[PDB]
Amino acid sequence: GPVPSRARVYTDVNTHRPSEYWDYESHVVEWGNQDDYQLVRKLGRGKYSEVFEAINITNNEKVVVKILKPVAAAKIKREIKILENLRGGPNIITLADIVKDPVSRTPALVFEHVNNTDFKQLYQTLTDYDIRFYMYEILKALDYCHSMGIMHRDVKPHNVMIDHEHRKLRLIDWGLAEFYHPGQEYNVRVASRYFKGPELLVDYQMYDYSLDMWSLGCMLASMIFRKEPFFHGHDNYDQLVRIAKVLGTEDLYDYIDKYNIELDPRFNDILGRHSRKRWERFVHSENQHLVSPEALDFLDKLLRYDHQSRLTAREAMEHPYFYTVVK
Numbered sequence: 001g002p003v004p005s006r007a008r009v010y011t012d013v014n015t016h017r018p019s020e021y022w023d024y025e026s027h028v029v030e031w032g033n034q035d036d037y038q039l040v041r042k043l044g045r046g047k048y049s050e051v052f053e054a055i056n057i058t059n060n061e062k063v064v065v066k067i068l069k070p071v072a073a074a075k076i077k078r079e080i081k082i083l084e085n086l087r088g089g090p091n092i093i094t095l096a097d098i099v100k101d102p103v104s105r106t107p108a109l110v111f112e113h114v115n116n117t118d119f120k121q122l123y124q125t126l127t128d129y130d131i132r133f134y135m136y137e138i139l140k141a142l143d144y145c146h147s148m149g150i151m152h153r154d155v156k157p158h159n160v161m162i163d164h165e166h167r168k169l170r171l172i173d174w175g176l177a178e179f180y181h182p183g184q185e186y187n188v189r190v191a192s193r194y195f196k197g198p199e200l201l202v203d204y205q206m207y208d209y210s211l212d213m214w215s216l217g218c219m220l221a222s223m224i225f226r227k228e229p230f231f232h233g234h235d236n237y238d239q240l241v242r243i244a245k246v247l248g249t250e251d252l253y254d255y256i257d258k259y260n261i262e263l264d265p266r267f268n269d270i271l272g273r274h275s276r277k278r279w280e281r282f283v284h285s286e287n288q289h290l291v292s293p294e295a296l297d298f299l300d301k302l303l304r305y306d307h308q309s310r311l312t313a314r315e316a317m318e319h320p321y322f323y324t325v326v327k
């Protein structure tokens with residue numbers, strides 16, 4: 001059988017909490033009034049959700065309304081519990097209300113307003129300094145949620161909102177997040193394909209917060225190398241192949257050997273044999289302005305097969321890549 005694993009930080013947080021903190025199934029949902037909101041304009045598409053800019057008619061303030069499609073609606077109590085648990089934490093989106101449409105019976109989550117900067121402009125124009133600044137803001141949110149015993153499990157640019165004018169960042173869409181309990185075997189059908197950690201791709205269920213750090217490394221690699229996504233897999237098996245073509249197969253095998261992971265028969269002939277590539281190989285005239293020895297060192301410490309060997313969010317904040325960032 002696979003060798004068990006546990007996080008190297010925040011392992012005990014959920015055992016020292018009352019059952020109501022993590023037992024989301026027991027939570028009773030207090031429904032607000034849907035008549036309190038008037039829909040202004042759409043700016044989101046998501047996966048199983050539609051996002052609108054609205055006005056809360058009781059205080060004339062702008063809000064964000066997330067209407068949930070049936071898939072997301074099924075796990076509402078978990079998303080509500082996590083959002084309520086993290087409310088007020090650094091760079092965490094603020095849940096303001098929970099409403100239900102009496103016509104369609106579909107629920108919605110209402111959040112604080114974020115005046116988002118166009119996502120393409122951000123990808124195309126953020127400087128080296130800005131990337132370090134916002135990567136640091138993302139680490140604040142991840143260290144906070146991990147410290148609160150929660151893994152996001154869907155870290156990707158679509159789930160990070162940035163108001164560049166106010167240098168304001170929020171980590172959003174906690175619909176896939178879960179409470180971390182040591183020894184628990186989780187569903188590996190999480191995150192979005194391009195950001196899935198090797199643990200998910202090889203069906204290693206006993207993962208932890210460190211999955212978020214792999215996804216964060218995928219975002220960083222895409223940004224500094226100007227390749228979106230960085231690991232462009234055609235499907236979940238090919239995803240691992242794309243990863244192995246950069247990180248190499250030797251280390252992949254060492255990882256599966258360390259945890260006694262049984263690989264899927266169809267991987268052995270498709271994984272082939274690949275050497276570990278030097279990060280400097282992805283550096284070109286059009287991306288040299290975003291790359292530094294510190295950025296490559298940092299990236300190297302996130303993009304590791306062994307989930308136990310990746311920097312934690314708190315360790316990542318101490319990295320030299322952030323020394324330039326005004327704190």
Ligand SMILES: CCc1ccccc1-c1ccc(CNCCc2nc3ccccc3[nH]2)cc1C
Nearest residue numbers: 043044051119122123134157158160219220223
């Ligand atoms: C490579 C991504 C990256 C790497 C390193 C540092 C920053 C980034 C990054 C992160 C996020 C964004 C902007 N993401 C907006 C997505 C979004 N808008 C929404 C509006 C409505 C509903 C849902 C939404 N969801 C941009 C960058 C550059």
